[PDB]
Design a protein around this nucleic acid. Structure first.
Lengths: 77, 97, 137, 114, 174
RNA sequence: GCUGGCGACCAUAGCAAGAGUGAACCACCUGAUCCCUUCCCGAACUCAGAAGUGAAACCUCUUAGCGCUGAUGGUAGUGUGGGAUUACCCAUGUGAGAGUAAGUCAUCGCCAGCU
RNA sequence: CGGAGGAGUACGAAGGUGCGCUCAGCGUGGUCGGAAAUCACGCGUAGAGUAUAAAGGCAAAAGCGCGCUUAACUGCGAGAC
């Protein structure tokens, strides 16, 4: 006989690009995510595909905040 | 009075996985004593004496005296870890009475 | 032969059997029990045969508690077949056994008769075993 | 519950104002009194306050469009001294109409830009 | 009711129930009328007849109620409406309990149809009224086949004894 | 001392039970004249005033009843080197989860009002 | 030539904006309507939904409704994957 499986999609290369304590310039992408695993904070923008990017020069920082416990990523100038 | 278990001080250098395995090879069982008004105390007891105490049923519902040096600690048995296969004792907790 | 009524997946990976059975090593449904001391696999037919042997000698005078269930499917290739062309077909179910795992408990029977029944049952199993009794701690 | 509904309605506007980082002109309506506040972007410092409970307007009805207009004039007067020019209005979950509308119009007449 | 209620029945309800605070007196909050035309999609006109009759009986425009979810057993699904209802408060509800207790009760074929029991347990009382005849309205001629009615009374009563006391003060038969 | 509004945290902060407040504030409460509203309803939204109330709700204080936080010791796992090959042992570094003792009825900012 | 499923589309609203609203499930009463139709109150709680397979997500809801509309524009584009 023959198997009816044997298919998979191409890789997408999702994940974090800039970690905490790193210096970034305006426009740098910080996180690539299929959903909102991380939420934008101060000086961080959100794209149509949920990508997070920097809107100002500074240093990246990660935190946990809010009632829901949402993880946030921000940039400190 | 019935149950008087001898013990020795177990310092920091005698704590951890390697030291515990060495003690069990030397036929000693580590144990901990905790309770109100005093900090936890780590001791080492003898396997034969602990087993003989274990055979007795009243040992679980009566008070027992652990002696290390001149110090005496009056406690009750709270927990007992056993090897899942051989069933030999491996560790003990004692609540100050 | 005991078998799951339903499952999410028909076929599962082989895996590896390591470690000890910290859970399920205590007597909780009876006074006397049989406990494994070396790791292995135990099949549904072996479970049934051991249960039958124990029940016959105890003369159905007490309760037998079975704490092993064959939940893991195992496949086999047809025969006279070359390598390749997909995974084989499910053929029987097993239960992984780690040292210290309890297999059968007996309640409401004399200790000597229960020990004799366990001795009869042990001759059917593929691993070493011992007998344990309930303890306070 | 009415207050919970009002807060849930006002939360979106408050969050957007915080994201925009603009000075906030907050208001509160009550059957008896109306209050107004002007808060900085950080949200921890109240730049300029006003209310109908002040001595000048206490003797009045304090619960109508005239009181709202007086409060708006007073808050605009205080804001001009404070030195804030550009502000963002915040209805705080109250429909922009009637007393709120009159208060906002009075502030605009006073000079606050929004 | 109306002024007579507010003037006299509040006072005797306070006296009868022996409640310290005046606000604790039970108050009628609303009455809801509900009627459903099952399988309306089949003929597509019983619904129009029903809304016309409801508008005639009550001085309020009824709202057509859509179905939620789809049920295979019946022909209904979320698409088309299946029933209508109205909610009455204020002077409207007052004149409503009024003319009901006035004209409808002497004419009911079987008196005491309303029962002391059947209360929901929270102080609210539900009644079912058979046929859309049995009110002051147009006669059998010039109207569509007969239809049922459901009325529900919600008050401020905190329990069944308070509710029954309120209905007895109003004049409910049972 | 006490009320309202705007803030930093998000259960050691929450849920449940009990007690109290209206002098000022909050809420309920009155009506459909003017503004506004209901896929029908002054139920919501909006307006004009205040006859009474703390009933409901809000706020404050207490209970650990729940919920939640949580040691120590031990165990599992694991990087490097060595010995074995049912997956373990020794040297060294590292070290959970669960469970136990114990703990928890939060806390800190800005503005306005009253006795 | 390992295990298990989808795709070769749909939508001038199923897009934009302003405003507004929360699901599903159970417990009590009522017409020919009862396991299961519509309606009133109460209990715990996202298990509802998101045009479509699954994953990651969704309270300022990304879920649901109404009014007005065409940014489903033109010329670009610091800086990043």
């Amino acid at each position: 006989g023959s198997t009816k499986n044997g298919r998979d999609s191409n890789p997408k290369m999702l994940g974090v690009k800039v970690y905490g304590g790193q210096t970034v310039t305006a426009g740098n992408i910080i996180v690539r995510q299929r959903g909102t695993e991380f939420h934008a904070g101060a000086n961080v923008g959100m794209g149509r595909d949920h990508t997070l990017f920097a809107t100002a020069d500074g240093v990246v920082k990660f935190e946990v905040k809010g009632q829901f416990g949402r993880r946030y990523v921000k940039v400190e100038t | 009075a019935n149950f008087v278990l001898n013990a020795q001080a177990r310092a920091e250098d005698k704590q951890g996985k390697g030291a515990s395995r060495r003690l069990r090879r030397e036929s000693l069982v580590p144990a901990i004593i905790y309770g109100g008004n005093a900090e936890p105390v780590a001791v080492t007891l003898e396997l034969r004496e602990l087993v003989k105490a274990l055979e007795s049923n009243v040992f679980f519902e009566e008070v027992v005296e652990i002696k290390v040096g001149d110090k005496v600690e009056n406690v009750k048995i709270q927990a007992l870890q056993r090897h899942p296969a051989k069933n030999t004792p491996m560790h003990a907790d004692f609540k100050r009475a | 032969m005991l078998q799951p009524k339903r499952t999410k997946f028909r076929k599962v990976h082989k895996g590896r059997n390591t470690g000890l059975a910290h859970r399920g090593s205590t007597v909780s449904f009876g006074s006397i029990a049989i406990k494994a001391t070396e790791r292995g696999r135990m099949t549904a037919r072996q479970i049934e045969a051991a249960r039958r042997t124990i029940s016959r000698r105890i003369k159905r005078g007490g309760k037998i508690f079975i704490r092993v269930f064959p939940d893991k499917p195992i496949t086999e290739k047809p025969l006279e077949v070359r390598m390749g062309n997909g995974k084989g077909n499910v053929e029987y179910w097993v239960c992984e056994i780690k040292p210290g795992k309890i297999l059968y408990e007996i309640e409401g029977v004399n200790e000597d008769l229960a020990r004799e029944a366990f001795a009869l049952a042990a001759a059917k199993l593929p691993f070493k075993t011992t007998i344990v009794t309930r303890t306070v701690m | 519950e009415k207050k919970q509904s009002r807060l849930r309605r006002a939360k979106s506007t408050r969050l957007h104002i915080r994201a925009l980082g603009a000075t906030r002109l907050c208001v509160n309506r009550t059957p008896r009194h109306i209050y107004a506040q002007v808060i900085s972007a950080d949200g921890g410092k109240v730049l300029a306050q006003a209310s109908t409970l002040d001595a000048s307007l206490r003797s009045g009805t304090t619960g109508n469009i005239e009181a709202a207009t007086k409060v708006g004039a007073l808050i605009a007067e205080r804001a001009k001294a404070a030195g804030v020019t550009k502000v963002a209005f915040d209805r705080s979950g109250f429909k922009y109409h009637g007393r709120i509308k009159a208060l906002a119009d009075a502030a605009r007449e006073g000079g606050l830009e929004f | 009711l109306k002024a007579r209620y507010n003037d006299e029945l509040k006072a005797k309800l306070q006296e009868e129930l022996s409640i310290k605070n005046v606000m604790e007196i039970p108050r009628i909050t609303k009455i809801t009328l509900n009627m459903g035309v099952g399988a309306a999609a089949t003929d597509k006109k019983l619904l129009d007849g029903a809304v016309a009759d409801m508008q005639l009986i009550a001085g309020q425009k009824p709202v057509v109620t859509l179905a939620r979810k789809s049920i295979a057993g019946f022909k209904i699904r979320d698409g088309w409406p299946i029933g209508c209802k109205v909610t009455l408060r204020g002077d409207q509800m007052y004149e409503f309990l009024d003319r009901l207790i006035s004209i409808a009760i002497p004419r009911i074929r079987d008196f005491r149809g309303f029962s002391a029991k059947s209360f929901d347990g929270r102080g609210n009382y539900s009644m079912g009224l058979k046929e859309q005849i049995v009110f002051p309205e147009i006669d059998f001629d010039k109207i569509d086949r007969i239809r049922g009615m459901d009325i529900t009374i919600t008050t401020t009563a905190r329990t069944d004894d308070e509710g029954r006391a309120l209905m007895r003060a109003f004049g409910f038969p049972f």
